[PDB]
Design a protein around this ligand. Structure first.
Ligand code: A1LZ8
Ligand code: ZN
Ligand code: ZN
Length: 307
């Protein structure tokens, strides 16, 4: 029968577009391989008249596409693009309410960890290295966060509907950020000093209190570890969830966690004119706070001990 054609664009990064002429009598998969339209898998579908001029994602199947994908995402995992598209097909349907100019996410698909991470990322100073994260983060800050959320799911190898860990999520994203100038000097009292750089310089697991880290924490005979010097724009202090008192103006933000390991619920606590509890789309305020906290973030620039 008749052979009709339309013009479309293919891409791996939505920056470099490659004009294609498509045969409407064949499926996209027969012509391109796995093919996606705004996240939806159209590999098994034939071109529709309405697809003319639209942009489709394809898997990198030639060296030009391979280079474009790597330069944009900073990954060689061949499953990455398909996982990113599968997540986007869901996150494009989430809602992203603004809370005091912070983009949150209405609860869906056990995404409380992602809303809490997204809110945190808008409150600390971070520069991503992969252009894909740079571009999507800028959009997310302005309220259009579906692509950023799908990329986070793909980078962290999380499926939509799976509850993830905020500390683990932030840690992996930090591996894609420019933290090269961050430095931490510790003394453990023999008396021994160590210097950490990069992501290890901004994370700690064992106490929520930055002040306690400065004064000294006991670690295994028992010794005292304390912070000698900190050069970073923030620090993330974490510990297994425990009841904790947060005081206005003494922290930047924090992760509240209720429930059991791997199956509970996160909320986000931030300090503004009072304490805000952002719970996806829901906001409550209170002058005081006591509750189960598992991460606290503190802004920083340069700290030097007086010990
Ligand atoms: C919410 C979530 C999602 C995923 C995961 N996972 C852990 C390992 C496996 C893969 C994914 N990776 C953990 C949590 C979780 O529940 N994470 C916290 C937690 C709760 C209760 C805890 C702990 C402890 C140590 C560290 C974290 C933690 C602990 O000792 N208890 C009793 C932050 C909430
Ligand atoms: Zn949840
Ligand atoms: Zn000792």
């Amino acid at each position: 029968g008749e052979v009709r054609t339309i013009k479309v664009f293919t891409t791996v990064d939505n920056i470099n577009l490659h004009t294609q002429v498509v045969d409407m009598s064949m499926t996209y998969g027969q012509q391109f391989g796995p093919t996606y339209l705004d996240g939806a898998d159209v590999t098994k579908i034939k071109p529709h008249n309405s697809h003319e001029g639209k942009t489709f994602y394809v898997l990198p199947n030639d060296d030009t596409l391979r280079v474009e994908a790597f330069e944009y995402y900073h990954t060689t995992d061949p499953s990455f693009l398909g996982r990113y598209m599968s997540a986007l097909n869901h996150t494009k349907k989430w809602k992203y309410p603004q809370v005091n100019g912070l983009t949150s996410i209405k609860w869906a698909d056990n995404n409380s960890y992602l809303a809490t991470a997204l809110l945190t990322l808008q409150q600390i100073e971070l520069k991503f290295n992969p252009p894909a994260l740079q571009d999507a983060y800028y959009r997310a800050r302005a309220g259009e966060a579906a692509n950023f959320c799908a990329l986070i799911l793909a980078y962290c190898n999380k499926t939509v509907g799976e509850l993830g860990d905020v500390r683990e999520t932030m840690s992996y994203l930090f591996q894609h950020a420019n933290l090269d100038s961050c430095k931490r000097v510790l003394n453990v009292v023999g008396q021994q000093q160590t210097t950490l750089k990069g992501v290890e310089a901004v994370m700690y697991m064992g106490t929520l209190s930055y002040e306690q880290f400065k004064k000294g924490v006991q670690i295994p005979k028992q010794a005292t570890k304390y912070l000698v010097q900190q050069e970073s724009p923030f620090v993330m202090m974490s510990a297994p969830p425990a009841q904790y008192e947060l005081k206005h103006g003494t922290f930047t933000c924090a992760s509240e966690y209720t429930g059991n390991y791997q199956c509970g619920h996160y909320k986000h606590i931030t300090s503004k004119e009072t304490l805000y509890c952002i719970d996806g789309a829901l906001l409550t305020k209170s002058s005081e706070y006591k509750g189960p906290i598992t991460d606290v973030f503190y802004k920083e620039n340069s700290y030097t001990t007086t010990i």
